[PDB]
């Protein structure tokens, strides 16, 4: 298919995509900003530390109510959080990207995460039961994830 902003050299490029997967959009948007431009051996070692809560994700745009941690001082920010589900899915297809890289013949000591965007998937609904005989929705807000990787030189 076609992605946003096709790479300038698809010979020395790689790409991966995950569609319609049930993560929060607002969590996955802000850890994809945390690894944009990041080398693939550093992004993996960062993403493992997000689950172990040794290193956090700074919530910049979707920050309402997010608590102040001490581990966000590295990022130049006050607020941070440790989404382990959100850092598991884009670690799962961080592996799929480097699966395609050796399948095309690329060096995984030179791959940077050039382009990673997160955009919304169609919401799926269920419902809650609130006071005085009313119905309100529990709508899940999944996401579409696409990433472009490129050898750095």
């Amino acid at each position: 298919v076609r992605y946003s902003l096709d790479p300038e050299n698809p010979t020395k490029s790689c790409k991966s995509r995950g569609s319609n997967l049930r993560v929060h959009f607002k969590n996955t948007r802000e850890t994809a900003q945390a690894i944009k431009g990041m080398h693939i051996r550093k992004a993996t070692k960062y993403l493992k530390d997000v689950t172990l809560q040794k290193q956090c994700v700074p919530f910049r745009r979707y920050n309402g109510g997010v608590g102040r941690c001490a581990q966000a001082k590295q990022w130049g920010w006050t607020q941070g959080r440790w989404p382990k589900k959100s850092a598991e899915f884009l670690l799962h297809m961080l592996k799929n990207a480097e699966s395609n890289a050796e399948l095309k013949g690329l060096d995984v000591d030179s791959l940077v995460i050039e382009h990673i965007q997160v955009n919304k998937a169609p919401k799926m609904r269920r419902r809650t039961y609130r006071a005085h005989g009313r119905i309100n929705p529990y709508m899940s807000s999944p996401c579409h994830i696409e990433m472009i990787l490129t050898e750095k030189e």
Binding site: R127, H132, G133, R134, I135
Partner: peptide, 26 residues
Amino acid sequence: SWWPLPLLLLLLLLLGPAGARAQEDE
């Protein structure tokens, strides 16, 4: 499988009346 099924109409019915009553000065 795959293709699931439709749910149900909301069917909302009104209830409460201007909160907790209240009468103006006479």
